């Protein structure tokens, strides 16, 4: 039964944790994607255990992806087949909200369908991770699992635990092979899921990398559709 100070405090702490972790040095390569520079990396973080990070380029402005992810969270099932449901429980100000989601199982059948109760904070950040009003170095949306009365674990579904995650977007402007000057986004996603298995870290690591690579396909299709329809 948390107060709004307590929710905001946890969201702020979670956002700072995800920003701190996503910008750590010295990651290990788990798996590379099809497209040059797409990668899933891991490392050990004290307090959290093994964290995964995706890094790839998305051919749209960082703002466009920020606004979609931030404002259009309930529409995630519409272009992402892995999200079966997305409901906003409560928006509590300063970019903080509570959400409910049901995720599909991984393509390996290692990660089963599960549901989530997530506390989020979306913000514009500076390069040293301070919240700014404009001219962002990067855009963040952090997630941590919490308990909300009215959203108990279902007997029919595993209640997943997000210990820390985020997606993080950094604007780029590139020169195409044609010589056009075009905005692109460096896209990073942090994942650190408290899985109830005794599954080898061996197999967890492949299953997690696969999920991460599988997601970026759907992000790119969403972007390419959006460019076909002249929206960017």
UniProtKB/TrEMBL annotation:
GO terms for biological process: vesicle tethering to endoplasmic reticulum. One of its GO terms (molecular function) is lipid binding. It comes from the Eukaryota. One of its GO terms (cellular component) is endoplasmic reticulum-endosome membrane contact site. Residues 25-228 form the START domain. This is Carotenoid-binding protein. It comes from Bombyx mori. The gene is BmCBP.
């Amino acid at each position: 039964h948390m107060s709004i100070d307590e929710y905001k405090s946890q969201a702020n702490e979670s956002m700072a944790n995800a920003w701190r972790i996503i910008t750590l040095p010295n990651w290990t390569v788990e798996k590379r994607g099809t497209v040059r520079g797409d990668v899933v990396e891991s490392r050990k973080v004290e307090g959290f255990g093994k964290v995964y990070r995706f890094t790839g380029v998305v051919n749209c402005p960082a703002r466009f992806l920020y606004e979609e992810f931030k404002n259009n969270l309930t529409k995630l099932p519409e272009w992402n087949p892995t999200i079966l449901k997305c409901e906003i429980i409560k928006e509590i100000g300063d970019g903080v909200l509570l959400s409910y989601q049901v995720t599909a199982g991984g393509g390996r059948g290692i990660i089963t369908p599960r549901d989530f109760v997530i506390l989020r904070r979306t913000a514009l950040l500076s390069r040293e991770g301070r919240v700014v009003d404009d001219n962002p170095h990067g855009y963040i949306s952090s997630g941590v699992s919490v308990q909300v009365p009215g959203y108990p674990p279902l007997k029919e579904m595993v209640r997943g635990h997000n210990k820390v995650g985020c997606w993080y977007l950094q604007p780029r402007t590139v020169q195409t092979p044609g010589g056009k000057i075009e905005d692109q986004a460096l896209f990073q996603w942090l994942m650190c899921c408290d899985l109830k298995g005794k599954i080898p870290q061996f197999v967890l690591d492949v299953a997690f990398a696969t999920v991460m690579l599988d997601y970026i396909v759907h992000v790119r299709k969403f972007v390419a559709e959006a460019k076909a329809r002249a929206e960017i």
